[PDB]
Amino acid sequence: MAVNKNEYKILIMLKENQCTTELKSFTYTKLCNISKLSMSTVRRSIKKFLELQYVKEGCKQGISKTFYITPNGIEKLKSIM
Numbered sequence: 442m443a444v445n446k447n448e449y450k451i452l453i454m455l456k457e458n459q460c461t462t463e464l465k466s467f468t469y470t471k472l473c474n475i476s477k478l479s480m481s482t483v484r485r486s487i488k489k490f491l492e493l494q495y496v497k498e499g500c501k502q503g504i505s506k507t508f509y510i511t512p513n514g515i516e517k518l519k520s521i522m
Contacts, residue, residue, distance in 0.1 A: 443521065451476055451486050452495055455510055456518045466499045466507035490514075 444452070454460070454475050460467050469487070473480045487508055490496040495514035499507045 444517070448486050448489065450478065451483060452490065452510070452514060452517075461510050461515050461518070463497070463509050463511065466509040468505075468507050 446453075451472060454472065455467065458475065469480055469483050472483045476483055487496055491498070493514075495511060495517070496508045497511055499509070
């Protein structure tokens, strides 16, 4: 019942990195350093995590999009605190 390490790795970085709130949206290139996995793999895992409801999107107004983590994802993190 523990979450798989390879894809959930993204959702582990912010668990201990405190990037866990709707107001703040994380960028792919900041995640690409801390997550130890390249910019394609983090774009693909975030595309899956929309279907899990863990992650949610922001708009582009000149600057590119960004994605915040929902309270529904933090509840999974409390299970493995």
